[PDB]
Ligand binder design. Structure first.
Ligand SMILES: Nc1ncnc2c1ncn2[C@@H]1O[C@H](COP(=O)(O)OP(=O)(O)OP(=O)(O)O)[C@@H](O)[C@H]1O
Ligand SMILES: Nc1ncnc2c1ncn2[C@@H]1O[C@H](COP(=O)(O)OP(=O)(O)OP(=O)(O)O)[C@@H](O)[C@H]1O
Ligand SMILES: [Mg+2]
Ligand SMILES: [Mg+2]
Ligand SMILES: [Mg+2]
Ligand SMILES: [Mg+2]
Ligand SMILES: [Mg+2]
Ligand SMILES: [Mg+2]
Lengths: 425, 427
């Protein structure tokens, strides 16, 4: 481990304060957007005397980045930008980010830290299935595994049959991949009559989208691995903003020596005490090219005390604020549905939620599949469909039309699964 | 200009001496640590210390594709697993992909040689590089990426596909250099023109095109269309990846081989005899500095000739004529797709897109050349008729081959995303 990972909280705090002061000054001096934002908010970098003072400073939102496209957020000259990446476009036009060579180095060290936290060992191979390209996931995973001194197998997305061929042949110890795509790889392993538990894989590091504890336990049992959660977003850096320690599996530990977290009430912008659910906000402490100050992530979670590290954790992401569905008056996230689906051993872990209107009433249709083994077993499927409907009603408050499709009926994820098709318009 | 390394123009005497020392090391490393080379050298009755000068290299046995295939996945490796930093693979063009590995030192060298290649293309401080080569197990994309990043440039790691979006980002990000296959460049150019833009007025100044053969005539065509300088970069996964050799933009006289790291020979592919420089034959490489996968006298199956250094001390290769695998035998006459390309490009009424289809009709090899009009000339039936006839005549009179010229509609030929499939052999 790095010394900082077990430093005292006093030591960490002091380090954060020094770096936050630097970052605020760097943004104000070198990022025209932040000179304007700070002036129009009536604050100066000098106003930060303690970490609690961060709440004086304005927020940065997606809109700020969209307005400055492509390169208006940068705080260094274009000749110092070593790398361009973009967000994935999930909510709209991708936003563009940049990195100096030092920022690439920092990112590589943080992803390496996250891979260590997952339980990596000298001699491990890493099979990277996160997409390579303008997306931050693939190249971020790549550089971090390479920095960790491991054997990098840079496969990227797609070609499921080939990925399974190479998992057999190359015997990777670690896979870095979305949890939804992991399911497709697991299916393919089983489709070929192989036993996925006996795969060489020891560790899965899954991120890029929400996945429940229930999902983790299912995947762990099916693949014979430890699975840990890695979090990031492109505005802040990419994967490796936070990652779970495999010895606790209690939500990603935030690398807050580099990215300082807050939680706010999304409606008011007020800061909440640790433990309360709301919107996750980050400020970069060491970023050169694109310092980012109080970025409202639109990801919903809560901050929790350090366990396996000095650094605090986040709870597993509940969802994006954009993920929230309002169904006949009840607010529901896809993860809530997923938790109930994963109780049914007779059903696959694949799903899609389709929202419609029938007259004036909302209708939520949950499309599921049997496991391939259970498909012919009508009695098992029938119990599953009824128990799932009863769990969603009793625990979530929504009446879900459960619709069991043939095996392979649901379009498989290519990366970030689309959990929801809202046809209500 | 971005700086030359001193070795790039140091004396040939100094270069020879350092090649010899590195070759002695590489042969020992292979023999001592690669269990395949221990077997190969022992069976040929040679030992590393048989190499006294560079002229002795042709005493050593060849390595072929089959050697690699027989060693899948990791049988060629010459360092322990925990020193392997990276796995890549060949593209599968001719069969099952062959797997290669790299230590950290290897990855560093590769990044240095791709940077050297990008500098040779005329890159400048502050340039943005749009990388359109595929990212993944293929060596191209990550090889280009690391090299552009090592040169200190601004890397835009797009990768393959999504042509409309690549064009949007060529507009929005205004890159200076694009690294891409010549056949996929053609698609990008089409899409620029389709979105109503003048491709000459693109921000791009330099195209660095490899991964497949493309003629000097194709070069001049793309240069005029895009308003760029276009240079050729060569590589193959067994040897390293892209950056084995790269053209100097000031001479455009075929890729200069980085023979401080990869020592080239040319052989008669039938006999294995080494040919004097200047004669066409099969290219053969020996790595001088590689750790994880030393490769000794690898028979590339690429056909070319060696030429004296011009812009560098290092020798050049001619632009690749083709793979051995590309050669068609058509009614007793040997013909390469690049020869067909040269004639196609004389026709201003026809696009630069093509694909050859080989069938048999009784005794006859039928070579059908699928072409398209230019967008502007598609409705001009007379111009297209003359282009067809003139192209058939050129192929017959200059190559000795009867071809059927099949004019498809615009977009009738499946577009390349990387290495175009030039020949579909249905015989
Ligand atoms: N471990 C994870 N848990 C749940 N969500 C995750 C995790 N890792 C990443 N995400 C989601 O992915 C987002 C980062 O993705 P990225 O920056 O590539 O673009 P995006 O948010 O998908 O698309 P866009 O910003 O264009 O709408 C995070 O903010 C979060 O919503
Ligand atoms: N600049 C170039 N001009 C001509 N052809 C090239 C050039 N660069 C690379 N190539 C071709 O690509 C080959 C290297 O590609 P790679 O190692 O990815 O696998 P492949 O040869 O296409 O597939 P496989 O070896 O599996 O049949 C070269 O040997 C050559 O045939
Ligand atoms: Mg986002
Ligand atoms: Mg296992
Ligand atoms: Mg189940
Ligand atoms: Mg090959
Ligand atoms: Mg131009
Ligand atoms: Mg033409």
């Amino acid at each position: 481990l790095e010394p900082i990972e077990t430093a005292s909280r006093d030591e960490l705090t002091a380090l954060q304060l020094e770096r936050l002061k630097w970052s605020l000054r760097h943004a104000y001096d070198h990022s025209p957007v932040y000179r304007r934002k700070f002036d129009e908010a009536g604050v100066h970098p000098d106003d930060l005397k303690t970490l609690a003072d961060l709440s004086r400073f304005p927020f940065t939102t997606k809109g700020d980045l969209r307005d400055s496209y492509p390169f208006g957020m940068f705080a260094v000259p274009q000749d110092r930008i070593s790398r361009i990446h973009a967000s994935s476009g999930t909510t709209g036009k991708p936003t563009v980010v940049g990195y100096t060579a030092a920022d690439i180095d920092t990112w590589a060290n943080l992803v390496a830290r996250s891979i260590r936290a997952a339980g990596a060992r000298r001699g491990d191979k890493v099979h990277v299935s996160y997409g390579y390209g303008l997306f931050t996931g693939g190249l971020g995973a790549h550089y971090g595994a390479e920095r960790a001194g491991l054997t990098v197998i840079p496969f990227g997305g797609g070609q499921t049959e080939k990925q399974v061929q190479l998992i057999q042949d190359f015997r990777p110890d670690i896979i870095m991949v979305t949890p939804s795509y992991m399911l497709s790889i697991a299916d393919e392993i089983e489709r070929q009559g192989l036993d996925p538990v006996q795969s060489s894989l020891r560790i899965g590091i899954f991120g890029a989208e929400p996945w429940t504890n229930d999902m983790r336990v299912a995947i762990e049992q099916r693949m014979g691995i430890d699975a840990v959660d890695i979090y990031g977003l492109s505005e802040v850096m990419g994967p490796g903003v936070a990652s779970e320690c495999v010895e606790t599996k209690d939500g990603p530990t935030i690398w807050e020596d580099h990215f300082y977290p807050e939680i706010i009430d999304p409606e008011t912008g007020e800061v909440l005490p640790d433990g309360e659910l709301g919107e996750l906000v980050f400020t970069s402490l060491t970023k050169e090219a694109l310092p980012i100050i109080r970025y409202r992530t639109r990801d919903l979670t809560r901050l929790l005390p350090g366990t396996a590290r000095t650094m605090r954790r986040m709870e597993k992401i509940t969802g994006r604020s954009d993920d929230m569905m309002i169904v006949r008056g009840v607010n529901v996230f896809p993860t809530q549905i997923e938790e109930q689906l994963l109780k049914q051993r007779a059903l696959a872990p694949h799903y899609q939620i389709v929202l419609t209107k029938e007259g004036p009433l909302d209708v939520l249709t949950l499309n599921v599949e049997p496991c391939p083994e259970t498909a012919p077993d009508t009695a098992a499927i029938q119990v599953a469909k009824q128990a799932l409907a009863y769990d969603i009603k009793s625990l979530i408050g929504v009446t879900a039309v459960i619709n069991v499709l043939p095996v392979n009926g649901i379009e498989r994820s290519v990366g970030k699964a689309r959990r929801v098709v809202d046809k209500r318009k």
